[PDB]
Protein backbone atom coordinates (compact mmCIF):
# COMPACT_ATOMS: atom_id res chain seq x y z
CA UNK A 1 0.00 0.00 0.00
CA UNK A 2 0.92 3.62 -0.69
CA UNK A 3 0.11 4.83 2.87
CA UNK A 4 -1.72 7.70 1.09
CA UNK A 5 1.39 9.01 -0.68
CA UNK A 6 0.12 10.90 -3.73
CA UNK A 7 0.29 9.23 -7.15
CA UNK A 8 1.61 11.04 -10.22
CA UNK A 9 -1.98 11.29 -11.42
CA UNK A 10 -3.10 12.94 -8.18
CA UNK A 11 -0.19 15.41 -8.07
CA UNK A 12 -0.84 16.28 -11.72
CA UNK A 13 -4.57 16.78 -11.29
CA UNK A 14 -4.17 18.78 -8.08
CA UNK A 15 -1.49 21.22 -9.23
CA UNK A 16 -2.85 24.60 -10.34
CA UNK A 17 0.53 25.99 -11.51
CA UNK A 18 3.53 23.79 -12.29
CA UNK A 19 5.78 26.61 -11.13
CA UNK A 20 5.03 25.48 -7.57
CA UNK A 21 6.74 22.09 -8.11
CA UNK A 22 10.44 21.37 -7.79
CA UNK A 23 12.40 19.98 -10.72
CA UNK A 24 12.70 16.72 -8.79
CA UNK A 25 8.90 16.55 -8.53
CA UNK A 26 8.46 17.43 -12.23
CA UNK A 27 10.99 14.83 -13.28
CA UNK A 28 9.09 12.17 -11.31
CA UNK A 29 5.85 13.12 -13.06
CA UNK A 30 7.53 13.06 -16.46
CA UNK A 31 9.10 9.69 -15.75
CA UNK A 32 5.75 8.17 -14.75
CA UNK A 33 3.93 9.53 -17.80
CA UNK A 34 6.81 8.49 -20.09
CA UNK A 35 6.68 4.91 -18.74
CA UNK A 36 2.96 4.74 -19.43
CA UNK A 37 3.49 6.14 -22.94
CA UNK A 38 6.05 3.39 -23.60
CA UNK A 39 3.77 0.62 -22.31
CA UNK A 40 0.95 1.92 -24.50
CA UNK A 41 3.22 2.06 -27.56
CA UNK A 42 4.28 -1.55 -27.04
CA UNK A 43 0.64 -2.64 -26.76
CA UNK A 44 -0.32 -0.56 -29.84
CA UNK A 45 2.29 -2.44 -31.87
CA UNK A 46 0.76 -5.73 -30.74
CA UNK A 47 -2.77 -4.61 -31.63
CA UNK A 48 -1.71 -3.28 -35.06
CA UNK A 49 0.05 -6.54 -35.85
CA UNK A 50 -2.97 -8.62 -34.92
CA UNK A 51 -5.28 -6.40 -36.98
CA UNK A 52 -2.94 -6.71 -39.93
CA UNK A 53 -2.96 -10.52 -39.72
CA UNK A 54 -6.75 -10.72 -39.35
CA UNK A 55 -7.36 -8.33 -42.21
CA UNK A 56 -5.00 -10.31 -44.48
CA UNK A 57 -6.78 -13.54 -43.53
CA UNK A 58 -10.22 -12.11 -44.37
CA UNK A 59 -8.88 -10.77 -47.68
CA UNK A 60 -7.27 -14.16 -48.36
CA UNK A 61 -10.67 -15.83 -48.47
CA UNK A 62 -11.67 -13.90 -51.60
CA UNK A 63 -15.21 -13.39 -50.33
CA UNK A 64 -17.65 -10.51 -50.27
CA UNK A 65 -19.07 -10.67 -46.76
CA UNK A 66 -17.32 -7.36 -46.03
CA UNK A 67 -16.80 -4.52 -48.47
CA UNK A 68 -13.35 -2.97 -49.08
CA UNK A 69 -14.23 0.10 -47.00
CA UNK A 70 -15.67 -1.99 -44.14
CA UNK A 71 -12.35 -3.83 -44.02
CA UNK A 72 -10.27 -0.65 -44.29
CA UNK A 73 -12.21 1.17 -41.53
CA UNK A 74 -13.02 -1.92 -39.40
CA UNK A 75 -16.78 -1.30 -39.66
CA UNK A 76 -17.97 -4.63 -38.27
CA UNK B 1 -16.09 -25.50 -29.83
CA UNK B 2 -19.53 -23.86 -29.77
CA UNK B 3 -20.77 -21.24 -27.29
CA UNK B 4 -17.52 -21.38 -25.32
CA UNK B 5 -17.79 -17.72 -24.15
CA UNK B 6 -14.08 -17.15 -24.86
CA UNK B 7 -12.65 -13.62 -24.71
CA UNK B 8 -10.94 -12.11 -27.75
CA UNK B 9 -7.58 -12.66 -26.06
CA UNK B 10 -8.41 -16.33 -25.42
CA UNK B 11 -9.59 -16.97 -28.98
CA UNK B 12 -6.47 -15.31 -30.34
CA UNK B 13 -4.11 -17.21 -28.07
CA UNK B 14 -5.87 -20.52 -28.61
CA UNK B 15 -6.15 -20.48 -32.40
CA UNK B 16 -3.25 -22.13 -34.21
CA UNK B 17 -4.64 -21.40 -37.70
CA UNK B 18 -7.00 -18.52 -38.44
CA UNK B 19 -8.50 -20.59 -41.29
CA UNK B 20 -10.43 -22.43 -38.57
CA UNK B 21 -12.46 -19.29 -37.75
CA UNK B 22 -15.57 -17.98 -39.45
CA UNK B 23 -15.57 -14.52 -41.00
CA UNK B 24 -17.96 -13.42 -38.22
CA UNK B 25 -15.46 -14.61 -35.61
CA UNK B 26 -12.60 -12.77 -37.37
CA UNK B 27 -14.80 -9.65 -37.53
CA UNK B 28 -15.34 -9.71 -33.78
CA UNK B 29 -11.60 -10.10 -33.11
CA UNK B 30 -10.69 -7.30 -35.49
CA UNK B 31 -13.31 -5.04 -33.92
CA UNK B 32 -12.12 -5.73 -30.35
CA UNK B 33 -8.46 -5.17 -31.23
CA UNK B 34 -9.22 -2.03 -33.23
CA UNK B 35 -11.29 -0.61 -30.37
CA UNK B 36 -8.43 -1.30 -27.97
CA UNK B 37 -5.83 0.28 -30.29
CA UNK B 38 -7.99 3.45 -30.55
CA UNK B 39 -8.55 3.54 -26.78
CA UNK B 40 -4.87 3.42 -25.90
CA UNK B 41 -3.94 5.79 -28.75
CA UNK B 42 -6.20 8.36 -27.10
CA UNK B 43 -4.43 7.79 -23.78
CA UNK B 44 -1.05 8.02 -25.50
CA UNK B 45 -1.99 11.45 -26.83
CA UNK B 46 -2.76 12.54 -23.24
CA UNK B 47 0.56 11.24 -21.93
CA UNK B 48 2.49 12.92 -24.75
CA UNK B 49 0.79 16.24 -24.04
CA UNK B 50 1.59 16.06 -20.33
CA UNK B 51 5.22 15.21 -21.07
CA UNK B 52 5.41 18.13 -23.48
CA UNK B 53 4.08 20.54 -20.84
CA UNK B 54 6.39 19.22 -18.12
CA UNK B 55 9.47 19.37 -20.37
CA UNK B 56 8.64 22.94 -21.38
CA UNK B 57 8.21 23.90 -17.72
CA UNK B 58 11.58 22.43 -16.77
CA UNK B 59 13.25 24.22 -19.73
CA UNK B 60 11.49 27.45 -18.74
CA UNK B 61 13.42 27.53 -15.48
CA UNK B 62 16.73 28.03 -17.30
CA UNK B 63 18.58 25.82 -14.82
CA UNK B 64 21.04 22.98 -15.18
CA UNK B 65 19.64 20.31 -12.89
CA UNK B 66 19.05 18.13 -15.95
CA UNK B 67 21.16 17.99 -19.10
CA UNK B 68 19.69 18.42 -22.59
CA UNK B 69 19.92 14.69 -23.31
CA UNK B 70 18.45 13.77 -19.92
CA UNK B 71 15.45 15.95 -20.74
CA UNK B 72 15.18 14.68 -24.33
CA UNK B 73 15.30 10.98 -23.32
CA UNK B 74 13.49 11.39 -19.95
CA UNK B 75 16.44 9.89 -18.04
CA UNK B 76 15.66 10.04 -14.33
MG1 LIG C 1 7.32 21.05 -26.56
Residue numbers in the entry:
A (entry chain C), B (entry chain B): 23 to 98
What does the paper say about this structure?
Two well-diffracting crystal forms of the RsiGRr protein were obtained. Crystal form 1 was solved by selenomethionine single-wavelength anomalous diffraction (SAD) and refined to Rwork/Rfree values of 17.3%/20.2% to 1.86-Å resolution. The structure contains six molecules of RsiGRr in the crystallographic asymmetric unit (ASU), which form three essentially identical antiparallel dimers (root mean square deviations of 0.6 Å when comparing Cα atoms of the coiled-coils). The formation of the homodimeric RsiGRr coiled-coil buries an extensive 1,904 Å2 of protein surface from solvent. The Mg2+ ions in both apo structures are coordinated by D74, located at the C terminus of the E(X)3S(X)2R(X)3Q(X)3D motif. The tightly coordinated Mg2+ in the RsiGRr structure sterically disallows c-di-GMP binding.
The RsiG–WhiG cognate pair is the only known example of a σ–anti-σ complex that is targeted by c-di-GMP. Here we show that the same σ–(c-di-GMP)–anti-σ switch has been co-opted during evolution to regulate distinct biological functions in unicellular and filamentous bacteria, controlling type IV pilus production in the genus Rubrobacter and the differentiation of reproductive hyphae into spores in Streptomyces. Moreover, we show that the anti-σ likely originated as a homodimer and evolved to become a monomer through an intragenic duplication event. Structural analyses revealed that these single-motif RsiGs form an antiparallel coiled-coil through homodimerization, enabling them to bind c-di-GMP in the same manner as the monomeric twin-motif RsiGs.
